[PDB]
């Protein structure tokens, strides 16, 4: 052990010195001079009220109009956000669903949770009813997050501490990503889908090459578990939210923290994170039942979404930036402008 | 708006099925089942009835339906997956009450569950299981309990005790000492948001389903009286 542990500690120190050698400013200095986001009011333009239990996750279709949402009642519901119509309600095999996704085509949705299986549902059936196309069984702990790259491959995250990439036709792990030490909580794909990033109950986030199966970079600075992660829209920075009540932003290229988002009266964990289409706003969903909108350059609180009676569990901004939706343990979703 | 009118009508057809399911979701009771590796909960589920990440056991008593969730293939770091069960009617925690050194680990698990911030509202039904083995070990005199619980010799059987006919003074002191070691935890940080319901139970007793039914009836009475402002 020891002879390699000294090289590991030397390399950790060398990497910290390399990050520090690149720290020729801070993003707070670079953005000190620019005008702030003037404080943003947003109003609940729709409320979606069908679910029987706590919403755990939601995701937008690429059309910016349909969204899918999952809850512990054991249902997905697909919502036409413009009309508030329920487009489908899908009965799940396990009540304890924790995650939800669309395929970018809108042809499929995916689930996972405390039954470790990722289940994929086909929406465009000849038979008219939605049904499970495949069950991806090989994970050995709960699924925390799923994201489709295309209709034939999905990346997934688990309490078994692995991420994995699957081929949907085969039902098989095409790659497995193993460097995390705690339960992996969330994923986000880069805009090109060549890279993804994930955070994992050990205060660290990892960047991965989808196409190589290796960790490329590791990020640290959190005091506690990372729950939420999201790429900044340019695809070379990302932000995280955690039980230490900080959001934090990192570059890939400078390979370190740029900004911390916190306020002294915000004492509680962050469940979810997302960006506006310009990247200028972070949106973060919290315990204490509300969302804070942040100027993602200046780190001011630019506004609040106040509409939830229980824990905000998820966020998503539409692909055209035309709205944000919030989901909650109060069993509603609310859509904002 | 002819297609939109038909889309709204099928949205109403979905809402009918959601309200039909709201009835069964309200009517059924959901029970998180927990315990050590050596716990006998895998036998309790059969008493209830008669890589997979979770198991649902279905049973009913007096036409009231129970779903019991035994959390399956997961790691020993519950602090994330446990948050799902912030809904449940009760937790059921099952222990080999069988004089193990490992009884201290079961007390550490019970303390970790009872004090979890996501479980502040949730009652624990507590099964001190395999007490046939506790009786055999203590009646044989091969029980060691004071040797690693260094207060059993100072502890003595409470007037709360109601032993079964013919149970030995040592057997009865032992079961109630172990019972009180769990209650010494629950009474410390419990504040009337949640209550602990201890039982003594064995690999074959039929009453486990009744113990659950009676204790959810109690938990629901306490919830109803709280909503009425009467408790």
């Amino acid at each position, epitope marked *: 052990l020891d002879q390699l542990r000294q090289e590991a500690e030397q390399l950790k120190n060398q990497i910290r010195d390399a990050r520090k050698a690149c720290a020729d400013a801070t993003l707070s200095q670079i953005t000190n001079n620019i005008d702030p986001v003037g404080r943003i009011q947003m109003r609940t333009r729709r409320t979606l009220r069908g679910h029987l239990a706590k919403i755990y996750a939601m995701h937008w279709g690429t*059309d910016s*109009r*349909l969204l899918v949402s999952a809850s512990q009642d054991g249902k997905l519901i697909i919502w*036409d956000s413009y*009309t508030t*119509n329920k*487009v*489908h309600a899908i009965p799940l095999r396990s009540s304890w669903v924790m995650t939800c996704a669309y395929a970018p085509s*809108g042809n499929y949705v995916a689930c996972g949770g405390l039954d470790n299986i990722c289940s994929i549902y086909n929406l*465009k059936t*000849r*038979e*008219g*009813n939605v049904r499970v196309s495949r069950e991806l069984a090989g994970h050995t702990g709960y699924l925390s997050c799923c994201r489709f790259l295309d209709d034939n491959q999905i990346v997934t995250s688990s309490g078994d501490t692995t991420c994995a990439l699957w081929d949907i036709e085969t039902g098989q792990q095409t790659t497995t990503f193993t460097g995390h030490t705690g339960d992996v909580m969330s994923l986000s794909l880069a805009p090109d889908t060549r890279l993804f990033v994930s955070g994992a109950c050990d205060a660290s986030a990892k960047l991965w090459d989808v196409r190589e199966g290796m960790c490329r970079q590791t990020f640290t600075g959190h005091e506690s578990d990372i729950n939420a992660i999201c790429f900044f829209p340019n695809g070379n920075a990302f932000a995280t939210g955690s039980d230490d009540a900080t959001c934090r932003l990192f570059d890939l290229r400078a390979d370190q923290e740029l900004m911390t988002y916190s306020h002294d009266n915000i004492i509680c964990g962050i469940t979810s994170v997302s960006f506006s289409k310009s990247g200028r706003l972070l949106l973060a969903g919290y315990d204490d039942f509300n969302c804070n909108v942040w100027d993602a350059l200046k780190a001011d609180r630019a506004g609040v979404l106040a509409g939830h009676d229980n824990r905000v569990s998820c966020l998503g901004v539409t692909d055209d930036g035309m709205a944000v939706a919030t989901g909650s343990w109060d069993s509603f979703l609310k859509i904002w402008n | *708006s*002819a*297609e*939109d*009118k*038909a*889309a709204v*009508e*099928r949205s*109403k*057809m979905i809402e*009918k099925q959601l309200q039909k399911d709201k009835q069964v979701y309200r009517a059924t009771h959901r029970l998180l089942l927990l315990g050590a590796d050596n716990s006998g909960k895998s036998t309790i589920v059969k008493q209830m009835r008669i890589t997979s990440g979770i198991f649902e056991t279905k049973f009913q008593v007096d036409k009231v339906n129970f779903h019991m969730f035994d959390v399956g293939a997961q790691r020993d770091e519950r602090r994330k997956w446990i948050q799902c069960f912030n809904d449940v009617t009760a937790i059921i925690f099952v222990v080999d009450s069988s004089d193990y050194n490992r009884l201290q680990e079961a007390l550490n698990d019970f303390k970790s569950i009872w004090n979890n911030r996501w479980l502040r509202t949730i009652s624990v039904i507590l099964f001190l299981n395999k007490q046939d083995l506790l009786a055999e070990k203590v009646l044989a005199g091969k029980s060691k309990i004071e040797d690693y619980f260094p207060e059993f010799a100072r502890y003595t059987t409470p007037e709360d005790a109601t032993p079964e006919p013919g149970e030995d003074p040592r057997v009865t002191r032992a079961k109630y000492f172990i019972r009180d070691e769990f209650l010494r935890i629950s009474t410390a940080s419990g504040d009337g948001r949640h209550y602990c319901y201890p039982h003594f139970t064995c690999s074959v007793d039929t009453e486990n389903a009744r113990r659950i039914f009676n204790d959810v009836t109690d938990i629901i009475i306490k919830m109803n009286l709280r909503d009425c402002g009467l408790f």
Partner: single-chain antibody
Amino acid sequence: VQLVESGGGLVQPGGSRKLSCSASGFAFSSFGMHWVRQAPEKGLEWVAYISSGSGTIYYADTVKGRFTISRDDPKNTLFLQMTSLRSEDTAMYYCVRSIYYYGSSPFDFWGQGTTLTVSSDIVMTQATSSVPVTPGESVSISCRSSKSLLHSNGNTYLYWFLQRPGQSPQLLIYRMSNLASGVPDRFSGSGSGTAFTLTISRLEAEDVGVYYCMQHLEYPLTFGAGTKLEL
């Protein structure tokens, strides 16, 4: 997927008949159903509709009160009851599938039809009645409506169907731009919202048949007279 009509044949005019249609290999309860006439050597004519779960019913004025449409979801079955009949009623009657939600394609599947032989509206017009042409050539077919089919939601409720000789109709396009599933990429459609075009990038022998436009902006549903393509 199948729809199979039954009943039909000879009727004396003042008498009555019941058509049935039997569905299989699809979730019948989820679909609204339409019946459509085709009088001998003439164009299509919609008669009746029922929603998913029977919540809405509509008729054409030529049949309102005189015919009634009814359903049996437990038996995947549809009916039409013909209370009194005319020389006006001899037609093939097609049973037709539809489902309504955002991005759905109604009218996507049609039964084989059954023949019955007897012993404002939006007016829809096609300027063409036949076009003589050969394989590999490109063509356009055009249709026009007395009211604009562009709704304020941004949909354009124009449907295009092909019927080949001896077949029932097939959906090509469901709203002007939207190509059906399982049809060649060779077909494409567009329009002004009051006049419309279906285009074929290059013909094949499988394109020989009659092309019907239809509106779905409001009931009663109305077809154009239908344009033949001939070799």
